[PDB]
Amino acid sequence: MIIEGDGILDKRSEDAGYDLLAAKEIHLLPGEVKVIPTGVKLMLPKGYWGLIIGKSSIGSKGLDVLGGVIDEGYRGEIGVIMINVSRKSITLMERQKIAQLIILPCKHEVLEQGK
Amino acid sequence: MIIEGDGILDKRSEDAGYDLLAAKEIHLLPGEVKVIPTGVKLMLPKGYWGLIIGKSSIGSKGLDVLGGVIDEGYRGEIGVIMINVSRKSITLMERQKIAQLIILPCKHEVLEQGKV
């Protein structure tokens, strides 16, 4: 798969997703929502979409990743929406692993107004 | 796919999911969960289920979608389970987009007790 940027890592065949990296150091206040830059662009194969999902490693710190849908046609850089649900401030370091990207098949169908 | 209602919109081939509109206005206090009606009933094709995932514009506001799994065998009105995990109250308006519906392939296996 064609990509641009270095905020993503190759994966084992036995793994479902690619690790996504935080482009820069981020500071999340309590309850704050942030869109974390990864610095990568993707060219997904025709017929598939990218699923941004969290890693147990950072989830276990009170950081939730909000469902991420990457469209086959998206050409901009990937961003990870993250909320700090803890009562204290949290800091993500540069290049730290923040989420996963899973490539799944997507079905296309026109909508008929039936019963 | 056969649908009934107008709380869902068609999509481009480069799109992954069909946007879901809110059928009515919803007010969610911080930490509140509510099912948002869409008024759309649909017939999932054979061998596929539908996954509901939030959109970036709403997610970026502290809103998440809980258990958005639409079964191949389900013909009721689609409702979106939304939770406000932000520190303040947000208001969603009628006809406003709230989620997306991505159709994915089912996979049926028989569970067999055994050594792993």
Place this chain on the structure above:
Amino acid sequence: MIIEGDGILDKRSEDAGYDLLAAKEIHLLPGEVKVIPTGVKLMLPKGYWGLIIGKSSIGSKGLDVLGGVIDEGYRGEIGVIMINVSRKSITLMERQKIAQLIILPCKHEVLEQGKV
């Protein structure tokens, strides 16, 4: 597929996923994040991965169910990660339904530096 445990239940063919039950009783203090054991091991078919989606019911109960990816290669016990987002402790009871597991296909490819 080959399973080893009690925490899972067979599904109808029109059902997208299998129910996961809580292995034991768990106390989640206010604001605590815990891994709820299920006591099941898997041998996911080749090429597929397991998606864990929380049960709506438990999200309305002050609990938030996090990242759920069971890798093809993963041979350990399945656990469900959650955080107590309320002001009081919440106990989960044994054999209580806490989420669903859905088997989905997976695409593997080498990452190639190019221009998008």
